[model samples]
Target chain A: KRPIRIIQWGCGLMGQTLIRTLREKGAELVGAIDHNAARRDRDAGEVAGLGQSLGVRIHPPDQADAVFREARADVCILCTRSIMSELAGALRVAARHGVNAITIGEEAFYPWTTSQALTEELDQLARANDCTLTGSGFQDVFWGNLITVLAGATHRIDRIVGLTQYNADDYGSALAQKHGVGLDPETFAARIGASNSPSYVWNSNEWLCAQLGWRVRDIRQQLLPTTHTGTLRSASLGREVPAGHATGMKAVVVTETHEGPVIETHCVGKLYAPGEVDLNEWTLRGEPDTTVTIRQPATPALTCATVLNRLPQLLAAPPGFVTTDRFTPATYVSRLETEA
Target chain B: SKRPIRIIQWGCGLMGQTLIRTLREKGAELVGAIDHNAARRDRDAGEVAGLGQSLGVRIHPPDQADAVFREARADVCILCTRSIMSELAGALRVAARHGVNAITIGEEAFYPWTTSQALTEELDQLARANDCTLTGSGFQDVFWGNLITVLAGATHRIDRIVGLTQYNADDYGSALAQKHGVGLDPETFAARIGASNSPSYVWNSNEWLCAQLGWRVRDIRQQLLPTTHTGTLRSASLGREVPAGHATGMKAVVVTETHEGPVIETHCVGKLYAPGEVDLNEWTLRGEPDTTVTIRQPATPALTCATVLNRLPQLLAAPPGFVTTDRFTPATYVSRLETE
Candidate 1:
């Protein structure tokens, strides 16, 4: 885009950290917005670890539209988007300001269940404003690209399942185990709710599976975890905190389409040190020959890093709703032939 | 490294005592115990196991597992408890929420995908989200049944996976198997043994293992046959009392769905005593590139359960979130290697 100006939203954990990365990468941090009014006095740039910026200040979500207009931002960057549906309000405001938007929020791409009407309205607004909006990241992004190619390699898309292992090293949260979570009875009930696991499994693994244009019916996840605890080498991990708690946490993500299951496993570490990502991988399965194959091995973190950095490329494309399958795969591959 | 595991046991059955014996031999300190009998609260599990050792441990009732876990700073809880899964889940959650990793002899929470999906997901999520984990979900999931599927599939084309059990549990074991089979309908059991590409089981332990590694195999099936001459059981004889219907002579099988027919089968029987690998704990992967992997667990269930629990702290390296056996650490790491 020509002479890009921007607004950064979601000044929480990811937003703050990603801002640090963007600034390190030498990007401009113009206007900033947040729902937590308590941060109005404190600088978002400073809090986000980006040091000082060009007089960038935090404003409430209500004032964001006017702020974006004043800044004349070419794009809105949302690295720290909320996991829940509440993100719609600020997104609407951003669209109203004629700002192109890209989000790291997992929920943004799940508008079908998260906010159909609002997503539609936002799409219309982006079109009217000559802008675009998209969100990418989460296991969905990685699995989506792999599954689409594998699922289609045979004849037509029939079914899917995704599994993943977690290391607790990737995330930092404390309230997790106590929050009706952990491998206990009450927490399990809370996760599945009243209906069935398919809904939850679908919520977790469906976006990638749905990209194949087949209606997803039954979704299920069977978690088989290790029986252990203790922190990673760096820090311990727990529900509320990821640093200095204990152990490796791994879970499998499995999804099903019309035919059968497509499995993906996720593992992360709370006590992350270098050389950790090497143990992780995802394998995609296809047709009769089982000859169809796609895998993400050596550069997973690098691949994920690439997905977030490449969000800027989607801006010039369509204004309507879309999945990664709708975009060109080449745009996501790393163009950096030279590295230190 | 010399410190005891800070162990807490959720149940006080025969397997629980056996674990106590093994851990003691291995120089592990048993820190706490949770049992159903309220009157006989403050006894040592070693005394209960018929081993004359007076190590320090208080056998409290089940409800107090959480408090005991916290007080002991329990590194792992050997969940060899025998009770309805609802109560087990409560204890497992408390242990998990308290950040104590766990190993259960067997919990029915997973036999039906509809049942434990949420619970496993929640526990896995908490562990991953917070970075701790729980496992050894069932006899099947540990290292026995489905692990073979994974082992076999990795090396060979894997046309079939057969699980056979031919151990003589004596009057104690046979009655236990007979009692276990009493509730099962012969017709329905036959039907499951007979179905095509279907997955179901009365014992979740075996089924869970099948589901864990069988996802890659496609159209996995769990089959069983109870063979007892006198139709007699000895649930209460072994200090591990089960209701009369909870004991028998049993055979477990896993079949993979295929075009020509089911490709593999693995079986383990409870009564038909076999020696020197006739027990058939084997995994075969076939094709021109034929490869086979077969090994007896060598360890008793009690020892296996106890061993798996040690992985709790190490597995907690991941964040608090949902996961599977393959999620945080590899499945066989805790069973046979240092993983460090």
Candidate 2:
């Protein structure tokens, strides 16, 4: 019944957005942390461009342990990275301090298949410390929960196909370069082709199967370069991608379930030409087919909102490294502090 | 978990037949069946549902409800009789007096608070006094309410939410077709179906969606338009051909203005389908991230039955009251009706 005490564990773009959202949702900002030197010692609200001071200064990552100890927060909102391994240290500190945590990490959404050892370790640590840890974001709803809810309206399903495209340029030059923007086909293929690592969509697919009680028999992935006929300027990369060169790449993952349904997803992260927009679409082929699409998704803002909305569930869950799918389906939160 | 859920079915119509089949497949016990139709009375439940074999349960008339409920000791009563709460009140009351939880496919019962407040309140009090729960569910539970709310979780800011749905009046029965004004003139159709302020499926769903999103309603406006075909179309329900330019059915658009700044609009087209026409449920949310979802060729009756059966556990677990499906978690696929 009391306000949720939150310690924000990242002060980057998403972190700042979370700070502002925490204030709007009536959550108490007990502490803020960022490794960036320029953000240190500044008010969390000011760093988030809230135009007012929150009075909670952004601390260095090195001070996270002491901050957690002093704050004794109910939960930690972690927004530093997408991979589970890279987020483990921050998560470890939160668990050690008995703080439940939720993050925007893609792999943390469902890491059972990809990071079993670290997931189990975090699970035990969180359980021992009497806190919970999990991952959530835009994908918590768009790519996972909504799809399963749609499935509830049907009697049968044989195959599911999901295709999502987002402007890689919005994420900065690092992600754009990683997507192989402005690279020759041969170079891109040699460097990034057919990654062994599971993609974000892959995790969502697994989450879907788990929710539906389908067992996975095998999973496969492919990475292919996308190119344009005409030269396109990459604002993120600060360069021009010549015709027939890679503008970005598409990752397609196919999962075979023992229960007879096959799940396939194509996730496209590409540098957009003028007039292009993000699109998320899914199709289910079966007794009664269904299709859903989301257009021009403000991914960053949605990610921040979902993280904030998940705070209550994270705090109430049994102490462990639980997955987002294990909780009730996502819903809009008018005020985080008032959510049951 | 101790035994299969005991169910007393209170209709032998299309929806009831589907409910019987789903109950059989989901492992629920069909203890008794009630129908007002003389022809359906005394017939085996499985025979009435068109299953090859009998389930050893004979159908009884409404007058025998008290006797059947006492003898069968059903844990729950499945009401598939009417769409209006007024028509369903007696059956609900009978079930409540028997201390039986009830779930209905009634459209009006989906959210009767706004339209049937007095009757809903009476039912709630009766249910509470009898220590039972009453809920409403059907195709709209997932397609309109839970699915839309889940999609809202993916949004950062929503300005307006739009929904468009279509179903064949012929798929229901002659009564529904007549209610929809099939084969009627525009003037008669308008007076009979359009002028009434009765809450429709879309109207109830709009309120349910707003409730789930934690948005308070400011005002709601509704409009009705007649639908016509270019050529004569066969209406199975009416057992006749609807001439061109005649009202085949009606399309109702309900708009709700929320105090939280988002407007909810839903358009429902229930009609006699022309050649190549199919059922559809589509929704769009216009906001920071615009979203659109479509369910094509949905089996409306089966979905309605499936949803009612799937919600049994939640309905049973809820405290004595008149609970709505929105108060429960998002609709989900129940692989089996009974837990181990």
Candidate 3:
């Protein structure tokens, strides 16, 4: 009814970005937290570049527990790291304070596939604390809505193929580095073995087969590098990637059964023309051989806007670690209908 | 979940066979099968459904409805007849009189047009007064109950919903395949659409999606296209051969645009030619970016059977008035598995 009390955690770029939108969407910022010491004691609005003060202050990690207890916030908006190992401490503090949470981490979007035990533990913790937790992002378009409905179209599904193409250059510098977009071939090849290398789309494939009722046995995914034609300039990276380098990466995940691969997904990220279109598509070869194509401009604002739109429903969901798959239908409320 | 529900079947066509097989596999008791074919009177239910053995229950004339209700005391009835204004109403009356709740695949059951509003009101009143719930669901593919709602969970802001499904009419069985002019000459196929209400098969699906999404759709436009065969076109179901320049398949499309820009589209195709095309389903939703999904298999008769049964509980739980898939979500189902 009134503006819900919210605390922004991990005040990195996204966390800082989410703060202004959260306030615009009727949230009262009672607290803000970040591991960085540089932002300590700054006004929340000032840290978010909103200029106008909102009475809340950005605190160091040391004060998270005190801020959570003092503010007694209803929701904690997290823009933390993708690696759950690095995210556990901040989440545990919020859970211990009985505060609900929503995060933008890519792997957190569907932690059940890889982090099953942790997912279960957090679910139980949230329930025990009388709070809720969930993860969401742009890919919810695929794992959240797209595959579930595609599976709905047919009774017997022999296979499903999902493809997503978006330029890493649109998602900022860290994303470019993760894709090895500006790295030389030798460095890219060596770095590809690192745990944080790009391979996020496999989560969608796993979620698809699970929801489709497929009894999958063999599961595998790989990251392959591609040599660019020449040097490439990026929008978010703000620099030129050298020629003879790996400016492109392809991630593939396949789930197989006795018949063959039942669910497969391929995601490609690379530098593109300054304004190339992004695409998300699915080809279903079943009762009605179906093809779905989605075209949109690559912009992070849309993804941010999606999270803002889901805020109301996420607030109304029952206490626990929820997934968009089970979020009950609720009216979407927004102040700005168009991109502002 | 305890004692299986007892059922009385009211037709022996393709869908009727579907009901019988579904009932047998689910361990439901078949009290009686009704059809007026003199040659088929008294045939065992199993034999009528192409099963190799007797099911104890035998076919009876429609006149036996009163007795089946009074004596058999069936828990419900499954009606597979068409012509909703005249045929569906009379069938509903018989079920109400028998004190049975029911489910049907009749197109008109989804909504009665102006010409049949009286019948719609009558059935709604009777179901409530009789303490039973009866409704209809069908066309059995990605667009019907399958694809639409599954996609609804993904995004709050929807600009458009589009789905395409293809099939082989020969596999749909003869009386229906021939009705579609699948084996007809070019002269006949051209005149068929003007004389029939074939496009309405997709009307319910469109209406259901609109109702569920809280959209007051303004108008609907329907179109049809038939593919011409260069050589001979033969149908196993139709038991006929169409000469060159005749139609070998047909396509149907229905579009319902809202007062806003959230347009809804459904596309269907049925054939008997190359690629042995049987089923493929594709769906796309343009929202916060876009998500598309596909199914590479058709809804097999068994799954169609399971879907109908799986959704029966919603009708069973309703307030004895008219309801639609827009109101009840189809439950997900898992097929049985065995090791080789």
Candidate 4:
């Protein structure tokens, strides 16, 4: 009857968005978890920049299982990292405590490509605990929700091309640095070679291929940098890059078969002028060609809303590690009416 | 198991042309094609489809269907006509006469609300007695019903189902463009709107949701409105810019309510205003915790071809009768040769 009980995990950008959305939607925010010393022991709401204290204090990850039990959370909203392996420990803890968990991790949305063993482990754990755990967010929203569903327009697919562009400046300092924004050309090139860059969309390619039942004969990622034409600035990094330096980077993930490339998605994050914006473009070539473009920007708030908003459906999901692909038809619950 | 399967294509319009390409690409053998148009008759299937070569299959008149069905022994028939109301009896009669299953791209097959129950039962009886599947499906069905079914897996109670789709009429023929009111003056558009033979394309989608959710329908309503452009706009179908006061497109809203207080609504707008705006099929499910999915792609004719083509194996394996999209598996329905 009441909004599903929620535990907010990883009190970072996404964590805060979840907190605000949950509070706004009237879902009970029972606990918050964070390893960050600055966030730990703080008011969950205030740390989330909601201006109000949620009464729940942000606890360190060491207390995750205890917090899960103490809060009686029906669902744990995990906003920790992009990779499922990165969130494995915390997710296992959530599973041990028998709380269903949904995440904003890019890979978590569909992580079998990285570690099928861990996926199976989590699946067994969640099944044994009679709970469910899964990942979601803007990545899932765009590729999983948007592209895959649109592909339903055709029964046949020859190729899938997607482009996602985001401004690294809008993200946290770490992301800006990872994008090579404000970095010199040599360092950017080294980072690209070392794969030190931040973007990880391999899961998107995997999920898209899986959604269409295409067998992946080979899958690989390519990363390149954008040399600065003009002086560029990064507010997050509190630094500037002169001309000839690297402003940002581009990453492409492709899944292919003997027939050729089937799933190709490109993500570009860069420093742009005042009026510049980010975008996501998808094109499907087959018997009938189709194109979908999104000019709206991708933000933590939007991704946060995208995941946390699915709390009810996520909570009720069959107990196991899952993705949006398995869920029944999800409806838009635009406005939540919270009880006093 | 065998080299694809034998397929007979009925109708030679744009959608039909798309179907032929899909069948050819998927390794299916095109045994026969039926079209009443003299211009299309006797042409090589591939040449008529502009595939640069011939598949050795020639298009024959519809009257020759029985001969083709007997001689070619098609495993199935793909119907691309616009509606089930127009083609149901004839298709079922053919199915009963020949032991062939059928899939249609007709909008009415997507839900069959406009079709009579007696007619459906009659066809259902014929299809069952003949050991075949006579069904209809396309992009709109995939967007509306299957997506809802997928999202519904996560939530408990569904309060409302809403889908809004936008299409650029430029890629389509003149009939669709004129149907959307593109190139019509405001006065003419208004007079047409008042009389409004303008068909609501999303009614079947609404009805499908109600049927899937097990809601008893209380009422269904269809409304049409003309969208006028402020400045003169180029018409894709007309190949010229219309006057400033001309109608750029048409928007159709279809709504259905159940006795349980839940609502299903869909809005479809085609060929309207600016060209920069891309195609969108956004579905919002308002129930337990709510879910929103936006499909970003033109629900193109190609995609529709994919929808029907990929269902070949599924239909062949399906029970003999008319099958609804909701009753079938939506994902992993691709034409994966390896998977089979």
Candidate achieving the largest DockQ: 2
DockQ (Cα-based) for each candidate: 0.01, 0.51, 0.17, 0.23
Tens digit of per-residue lDDT, candidate 2, span B232-290: 88887778888899898988889999988999999898998878999888788787556
Q: Which stretches of candidate 2 lie above 4 Å from their native place?
A: A1-10, A19-21, A24-60, A63-75, A128-130, A173-191, A215-217, A230-246, A257-260, A273-276, A338-340, B1-4, B71-73, B129-131, B259-261
RMSD of each: 23.4, 3.4, 6.4, 6.3
Query: What is the Cα-based lDDT of residue A191 in candidate 4?
Result: 62
Candidate with better DockQ, 1 vs 4? 4
lDDT of 4: 0.72
lDDT of 3 by residue, B1-340 (tens): 2566778888876778877876666566788788776766788878988888788877888887677667677777888766354677877888876658887776557655433667778887887778887777655533464455544544445778887877666655554475456767666776875356454556656766776666777888877777666678667777888777777777778898888568888886677766555576667767744656554464544444555665554556666665555556544432321111
Ranking by lDDT: 2, 4, 3, 1
lDDT of 4 by residue, A111-135 (tens): 7757789999999999999998988
Better of 2 and 4 by TM-score: 2
Q: How displaced is residue B74 in candidate 3, in Å? A: 5.7
How many clashes in each candidate?
140, 0, 24, 25
Q: Candidate 1 on A1-340: residue-level lDDT in tens?
A: 1334567786655566545544543456678887766667467777676645547788877777677778876667774433435566666766777777776555565556546686787778888877777766543333444334323222212234333333443433321231112333333444533323222223446566455444455544443323233323323223332232323333444454563444443433223344443332333332211221112122223323433444456565677555444553313111112112
lDDT of 2 by residue, A30-77 (tens): 999998888999998898898879789999988898899899799999
i-RMSD of model 2 (Å, 1 decimal): 2.4
User: Which is the leading candidate under lDDT?
Assistant: 2
B195-274 per-residue lDDT for model 1 (tens digits):
43123223344444435433423455565565444333433344333233332345656565544343555565654332
